[PDB]
Amino acid sequence: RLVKALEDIMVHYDNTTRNSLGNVIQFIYGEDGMDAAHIEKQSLDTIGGSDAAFEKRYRVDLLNTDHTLDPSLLESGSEILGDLKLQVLLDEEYKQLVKDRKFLREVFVDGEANWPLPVNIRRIIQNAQQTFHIDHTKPSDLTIKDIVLGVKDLQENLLVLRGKNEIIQNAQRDAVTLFCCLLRSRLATRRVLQEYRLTKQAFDWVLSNIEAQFLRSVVHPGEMVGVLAAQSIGEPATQMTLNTFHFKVTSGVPRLKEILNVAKNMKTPSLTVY
Amino acid sequence: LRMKHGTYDKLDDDGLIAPGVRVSGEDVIIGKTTPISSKRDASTPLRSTENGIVDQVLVTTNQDGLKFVKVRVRTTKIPQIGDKF
Amino acid sequence: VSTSTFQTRRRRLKKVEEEENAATLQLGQEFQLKQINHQGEEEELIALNLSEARLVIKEALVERRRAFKRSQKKTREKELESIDVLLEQTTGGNNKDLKNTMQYLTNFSRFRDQETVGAVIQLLKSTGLHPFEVAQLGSLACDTADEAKTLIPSLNNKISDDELERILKELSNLETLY
Amino acid sequence: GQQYSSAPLRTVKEVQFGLFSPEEVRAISVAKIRFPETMDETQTRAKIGGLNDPRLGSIDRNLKCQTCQEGMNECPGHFGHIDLAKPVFHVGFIAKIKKVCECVCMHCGKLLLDEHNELMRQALAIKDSKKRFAAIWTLCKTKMVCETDVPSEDDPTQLVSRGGCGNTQPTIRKDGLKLVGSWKDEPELRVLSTEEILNIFKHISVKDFTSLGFNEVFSRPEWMILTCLPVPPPPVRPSISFNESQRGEDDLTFKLADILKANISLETLEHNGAPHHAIEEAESLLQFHVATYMDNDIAGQPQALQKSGRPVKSIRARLKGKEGRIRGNLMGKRVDFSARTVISGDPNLELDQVGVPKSIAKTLTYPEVVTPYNIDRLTQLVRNGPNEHPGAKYVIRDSGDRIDLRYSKRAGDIQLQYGWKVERHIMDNDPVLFNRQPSLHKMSMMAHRVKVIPYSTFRLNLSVTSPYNADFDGDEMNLHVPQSEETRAELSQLCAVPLQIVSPQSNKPCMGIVQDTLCGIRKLTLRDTFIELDQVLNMLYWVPDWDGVI
Amino acid sequence: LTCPECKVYPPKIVERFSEGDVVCALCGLVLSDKLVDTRSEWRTFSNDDHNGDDPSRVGEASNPLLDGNNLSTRIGKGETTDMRFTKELNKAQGKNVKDNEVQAAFAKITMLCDAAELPKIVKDCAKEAYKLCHDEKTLKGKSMESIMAASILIGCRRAEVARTFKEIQSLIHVKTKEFGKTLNIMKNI
Amino acid sequence: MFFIKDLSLNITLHPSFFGPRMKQYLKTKLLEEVEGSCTGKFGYILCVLDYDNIDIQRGRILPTDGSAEFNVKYRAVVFKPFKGEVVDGTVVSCSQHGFEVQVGPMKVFVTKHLMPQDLTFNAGSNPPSYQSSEDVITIKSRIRVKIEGCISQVSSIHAIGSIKEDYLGAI
Amino acid sequence: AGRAALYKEVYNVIASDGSYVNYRHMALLVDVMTTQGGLTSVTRHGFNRSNTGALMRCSFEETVEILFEAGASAELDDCRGVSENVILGQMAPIGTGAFDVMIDEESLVKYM
Amino acid sequence: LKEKAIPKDQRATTPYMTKYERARILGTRALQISMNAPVFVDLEGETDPLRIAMKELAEKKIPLVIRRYLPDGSFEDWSVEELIVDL
Amino acid sequence: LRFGEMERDCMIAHGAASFLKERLMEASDAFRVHICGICGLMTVIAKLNHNQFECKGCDNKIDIYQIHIPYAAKLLFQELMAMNITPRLYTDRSRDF
DNA sequence: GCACAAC
RNA sequence: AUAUCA
DNA sequence: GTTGTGCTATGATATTT
Ligand SMILES: [Mg+2]
Ligand SMILES: [Mg+2]
Ligand SMILES: [Zn+2]
Ligand SMILES: [Zn+2]
Ligand SMILES: [Zn+2]
Ligand SMILES: [Zn+2]
């Protein structure tokens, strides 16, 4: 029944999800436009922790002796101190970071950090160190501008939806909202220089790989998405054993019938009052 | 008409194989024709997936006296790979 | 593999709809005058009188001999002969249909030169009759406006009796004396 | 093969459903069908100018198919007609027919509710033909009078006269396969006869039945009532001639003969002195046979049974269930170039390989096409013959002529021509679809790489057990061989095992290390575990990807 | 069939049923590809399905030698059935019902064999002996209950079922010399 | 009459022709299949114009065999007779039943009964002719005919004509 | 809000077994049940009562009663469903069938 | 109507080749090659028509063109020369 | 062996469209009928030898397409016709989309 | 034997 | 049709 | 309120009239 109901749902060449009638079901497959097989659980960082430790991790204050970047972290660090033009970039960067925070907390209200997102950024930073033999004791040749403006320019390249009009472009910005939140939390100026100790060469490679991997992760038009969905649900419903085990709401297979039949007379009706 | 591609040589003129002859796939154990007019072939071949040696062959008539013949085929099945235990 | 046209039609299942064709200018569904270009623009029907048809085909069969020699890189009575040369060079040779058409066109054409044909084309196009009628007027030589309106009943009242006689006068003059 | 036709090959783009106009049924038909006799020109061996091939389809390995010729493996079979004595209901629309009658004025033919009515104006606005009929019916099933006089859309003071006729409408109810009316001290009750209905429907206006969902060209109400009967050709109802005293006819051929017999009977009754009640008695017999032929599982009615006590396989019932024509011959069907056997595990195979018994590989075939690349290699295969493993079974010429290599005397001599095909044995590294039922998700069918091995089992790597859900307790699996160069590309590029490793079902790999290897990979990994030189060299060598550096 | 390439008068051809092909044994040319299983195809007409669940079971076998070609189903009770419509449609078959009635003399042979303890192969020979001699001018006007009493010994004398003429004199009836002359004018036919 | 028509044919190419002389083979296959054919729908397709600008377009590749199907758009001169059309032509045959007049690629038959009163078939003439006092119609003369009707036999179009009315006949 | 609670209730049935299905698959099912305007059941009188192709609807559960109605309503099947092309034995418009491949003479003369 | 051909600029689909597009191109070309279609690449001893088609595809010398149908009837033509292969 | 519904769902979920087609046609049923292009019926009297066609009833000898469909599909349409239903097959579209 | 659909 | 197989 | 109407796991294999 599940298959025969999702049969003709697929993704079309405008990254939309329609049936044999052209009726729109989803506007961008999976709401993100990503092919499920290319997704991995990743820690969203930003979302949790104390405000105090968040500040310790992301804030850079080139205008303050203590909270600036130590000249051990980069070459330009000694002549970076007090640079008013630059500090507006980092102020922007950190303002955008705290925006993401209050947003992620509006999206995952329980504060869960680990969600499935494409492109494993943690393993790209790893592969960048293993590759360029990053020296965790020598200053990098990155400029604040190199890092900050680089990550802003990458973001504009992670396109799922092309389309010159405004509506499509908006649906584009929206489908990359959560990924870019992850992205800014991992290539934040401080974190790049202090925790990853990347070099200009490594950093540029990392941004290159991110873009190329992101592209590889978007759904291919033609993907039968619906049959795929029915099987993805039908199959583990077979492995379902209740078959309780060692031993008051109806769960498992018989409850799954109710849901699909939209049975008006359900066995275990209840409501959780807070 | 419509003879079986299998071989009929193992048949004695009574249309039966004598017991003791070794058989094999598609070979003709019992020769039969259904005259209609000269006559079509209604013979019984050994199952194509099997083989062995004919164990015993008996000729009889039934409750109303129709000649009918039973043929036993013996094989020895030696444990092989896909076999279940 | 049945060669198709330039226009579309709704298959109402009732094949019983086709009408006949006459000299009430009811040509086919195919040959009605508002028809469509390969580029998709709506142009008018093209019916040729002979002379005009004889030139189109001749001009086209020569454009074709050219192209065949390119790819090779890597008096009326006299014309009847030259034409049969051009055919054995450019056509499939089995084309008895075209071979007769050229013998016919070559023997029945009133105007020989492209200039003369153009003169007929100019003259007959101020009258704004059907393209079928101007073709007939270019093919059938007539002396009286009655002869015309008898052999081309499609006219009757489209053009005046005396204005049509003016035209037959100018056609008779343009007529090539082989 | 199947011979060439100059007709343009096209694909089906639209399917236009409708009902058969009796005019059309008559027009298509290539035979009259007059007699309930099968063949037997009285104890003979030829078809009777009456039922199956009166002029019709052809069977029995004989061309004769009315000029058309061709015979069996080309002839689609063409239809005959049967002219019914009186109209009868098509069982499928007894429903609809009753509903239409409730919507239309009987004896008049007008719709019971106008655009003048306010709720009907709304129903008539509906876009879906099906939903519109629903609304319209629910409105004027209760309208029990054909109005002549109706208040205008200005004010109820002056009435505007709509369509005439001012009769009472019967409350129509279904009694068996008959429709019974009732007009309102004690009402008038009688049976609406088919001829009435058929006539009332014809009078229904084109704009009216169009509003009722019908369509002026393809599906008119009057065609819900059967007047002419399309007779299906033998292909749809095959016969078999066993041994001159045994002959098998299809249940439809039986059911048809009853329709005919019942028809011939009622025709004689009407022609003769019509005894009214002895005719309607014979009509509702005809009604039954025709009805029971399209559907034998009818609620309320007795089933038509076939001597042995079994009920006649109606047409409905052939399409219906799983194992029907839809679920079981179209949406799924058995296929050639397939194989099945017991699986067993093999730790010495690659993940993407599959162990194929030599016996199976010698039976299954791939029709490789001769080009000057494989021309030498194929000539050797043909020359091997179908007995030795690396060889071939058939050679197919350009004409479509196929030659059984096991019967040609100059087998190795056949000078292959480019464009000819050679059906060769499945060889090592040919791509195959491997499948274990029930195929619950897409990893239950994966493209593998043939390794021809001995013994009678399919051999697969253990880590591939997890998605097929196979244990080796006597499980069997299915192999399918692609036949096109194009179709194997679809397997190798899309369905291939190594591709299916990371699954979209749950964004994680669905295949892992299992059983022995999982258990032993722990015992190898302990800090206690040390290995000495002699056995280390053996482990190293055992890795095929070893860089040769101790 | 005969191979178009070879053409030798005894056309040596094999039916490779297993590959579903008809081959010429000499040149190897395949002469046909569509090939059908007659056993399983015959299983669709004469099966073991009396219940009605088999989707393969779709026809029924008949006997064109004995009852000619009379295809006819019977109105009977089904799962969802009112006992009213069965009666009406059966009372309607009564109005639709001479030599098409002399087939009830098969019911005379069948009820005689079952009273004489005779096999199913004997009845079908007695019914074929009776169908091919009951309208003969060579029998003309013989005792009509002694010509079917003679066609039972004709059916027994081929099916190898030992039945003396005095054994059939006990059944019906038989007038000895009357069904003895009739047992000879038919024997010539 | 004698029209120029915008037509399109579907040719299918087997992959082995997917070489450099592809467009050439196609235009050739067009001139083979279309030129000198005859259909009820368009008449006699006599000659294809502008051999250089024949549009080959792109070829959809069929999904079973590798072959590729094109929709070749071309312009042609056609000939389709109509009832009521008046045509000049030549007599090609002449029997006791009438005579045929070859007009363009098509013949038109003039039955002896759509002929002037006194114009009657005389068989003593060599060759047999129609011999009025002021007319002689035989196997080579030029005639003006009025087409009384056409018969479509999808391979050729044949027609029947009259010379009875005013302004017709010999010329 | 019903769409959400419907995903939530389905999610619970999968997570109660300790299993995990990627959000999109469940969201797709749920999104399908609700784009009609209300809760469309995955049953013979739900999803199979929509206005899709007639052969498609007939391949699940109601077969003949769907084809009779298809006849009297003079339905037209546009053959975009996978079911139709399978019944018809044509290359389905799915995956490898979601586009078309054509030869270009211009560039073929370029490469050779 | 054939006005539903979206022009070269104004194309808006992925400039990357889809996994099925590539599968069909390889299959299609391999097929034609095995049907003796001319080969547009120096086969360096290669004999398997799929292996050859892959060599054609990695040299961008397949003269095919994907016609991408949109759900409303329109289409965008892309040539394998221009599509990006990153699979 | 039976390539069933569930085995079909898998070949779809994979996107292997041609494989599905080959498995359902070449690997099995695979029949060719001629249809009239006026009524979408299969009532054409195709005498392939004489290259004559014609669908009388439409009196059409010019508008005929040949198509490739499963025999079981041809069986299905003939059975629907048997029941008065007209499964009309057309080779051109008329609907947009 | 359900469970939901129409009388 | 029963029995059975995973 | 009652009736009435669709369906109810995938494939496989072996006999019995
Ligand atoms: Mg198991
Ligand atoms: Mg297991
Ligand atoms: Zn035929
Ligand atoms: Zn009325
Ligand atoms: Zn031979
Ligand atoms: Zn037709």
Side-chain angles (χ1 to χ4, degrees), chain A residues 74-135:
Chain A
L74 70 164
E75 297 170 349
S76 49
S78 55
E79 61 207 305
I80 226 83
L81 211 176
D83 201 310
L84 287 100
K85 297 243 75 275
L86 286 178
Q87 247 295 118
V88 198
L89 277 180
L90 289 328
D91 282 355
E92 146 205 306
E93 170 198 74
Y94 178 93
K95 186 190 299 94
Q96 177 57 40
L97 281 185
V98 314
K99 198 174 174 188
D100 299 330
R101 201 165 193 263
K102 315 310 169 197
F103 169 77
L104 284 191
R105 289 193 167 186
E106 283 186 45
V107 166
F108 312 105
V109 72
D110 58 282
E112 172 58 26
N114 301 290
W115 295 94
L117 289 176
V119 191
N120 195 296
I121 310 190
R122 182 182 167 92
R123 276 193 288 99
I124 295 195
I125 260 56
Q126 281 167 352
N127 292 336
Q129 296 157 307
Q130 269 171 346
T131 298
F132 302 93
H133 297 337
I134 258 69
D135 190 289

Side-chain angles (χ1 to χ4, degrees), chain A residues 12-16 18 22 35 160-163 212 215-216 220-224, chain H residues 11-21 66-72 86-87:
Chain A
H12 292 274
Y13 277 98
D14 50 341
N15 293 117
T16 191
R18 305 154 176 260
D35 172 22
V160 164
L161 273 177
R162 293 141 229 279
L215 295 172
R216 203 170 308 109
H220 296 224
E223 269 275 0
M224 291 308 300
Chain H
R11 252 135 82 262
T13 53
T14 321
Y16 288 84
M17 209 183 186
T18 83
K19 82 183 81 180
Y20 315 103
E21 282 172 1
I66 287 85
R67 170 162 296 190
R68 286 165 166 177
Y69 295 89
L70 284 168
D72 73 333
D86 187 25
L87 302 83

Side-chain angles (χ1 to χ4, degrees), chain I residues 36 38-39 43 55 58:
Chain I
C36 173
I38 291 178
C39 56
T43 55
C55 160
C58 292

Side-chain angles (χ1 to χ4, degrees), chain C residues 49 110-111 116-125 127 133-143 148 152 164-177:
Chain C
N49 60 111
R110 300 169 70 198
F111 320 95
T116 308
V117 175
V120 170
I121 261 58
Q122 213 79 340
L123 171 71
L124 295 181
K125 207 37 203 178
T127 76
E133 293 163 342
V134 292
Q136 286 286 268
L137 283 175
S139 298
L140 300 169
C142 297
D143 295 345
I152 312 173
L164 170 54
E165 282 198 336
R166 275 176 176 277
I167 290 158
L168 304 191
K169 289 159 192 171
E170 249 310 306
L171 286 187
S172 60
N173 290 329
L174 293 176
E175 271 191 288
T176 297
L177 214 165

Side-chain angles (χ1 to χ4, degrees), chain B residues 2 5 34-35 37 40 80-82 84, chain D residues 45 61 242-244 342 344 456-457 459 473:
Chain B
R2 300 185 77 250
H5 61 252
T34 49
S37 177
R40 307 90 192 248
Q80 202 207 147
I81 278 216
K84 193 161 174 268
Chain D
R45 210 177 105 151
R61 289 181 279 195
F242 205 69
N243 272 338
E244 322 297 329
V342 195
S344 32
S456 316
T457 51
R459 302 210 138 258
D473 55 22

Side-chain angles (χ1 to χ4, degrees), chain C residues 1-7 20-23 26-32 35-39 43 45-50 53 56-57 60-61 63-64 67-68 70-71 74 76 90-92 94-98 100-101 104-105 107-108 131-132 135-136 139-142 144 146-147 150-153, chain F residues 1-12 21 24 28 31-52 71-75 77-90 102-106 142-144 146 155-156 165-168 171:
Chain C
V1 280
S2 291
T3 187
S4 184
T5 180
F6 47 55
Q7 53 180 85
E20 70 148 14
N21 327 30
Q26 282 175 239
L27 296 326
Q29 205 236 101
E30 288 302 320
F31 299 82
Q32 23 92 243
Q35 73 175 26
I36 304 107
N37 229 339
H38 259 323
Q39 303 93 75
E43 82 184 353
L45 211 208
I46 16 274
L48 339 161
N49 60 111
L50 331 181
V56 162
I57 297 189
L61 280 182
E63 233 63 48
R64 202 197 292 191
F68 291 165
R70 267 175 267 169
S71 77
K74 199 171 183 179
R76 183 215 67 258
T90 62
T91 205
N94 60 278
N95 205 327
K96 51 182 179 186
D97 290 342
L98 184 51
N100 290 351
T101 296
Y104 169 92
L105 280 162
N107 273 329
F108 285 99
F132 177 96
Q136 286 286 268
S139 298
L140 300 169
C142 297
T144 65
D146 172 45
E147 185 162 9
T150 293
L151 295 182
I152 312 173
Chain F
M1 212 275 112
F2 249 116
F3 306 91
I4 288 181
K5 189 69 186 179
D6 300 89
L7 304 175
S8 67
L9 175 60
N10 294 260
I11 300 97
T12 319
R21 274 303 168 182
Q24 163 130 43
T28 288
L31 297 184
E32 295 157 349
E33 286 178 36
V34 142
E35 189 164 62
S37 86
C38 189
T39 50
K41 199 186 178 196
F42 307 118
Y44 294 74
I45 304 98
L46 289 178
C47 169
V48 181
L49 316 170
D50 200 333
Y51 178 83
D52 295 284
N71 176 70
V72 175
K73 318 174 115 62
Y74 67 108
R75 262 190 160 220
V77 177
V78 280
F79 188 98
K80 169 129 174 52
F82 301 86
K83 165 185 143 301
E85 178 177 354
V86 166
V87 295
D88 287 332
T90 330
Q102 176 93 61
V103 172
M106 150 214 73
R142 292 204 189 187
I143 263 75
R144 174 171 287 175
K146 163 166 150 196
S155 39
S156 282
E165 11 274 86
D166 299 83
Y167 295 104
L168 289 184
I171 46 181

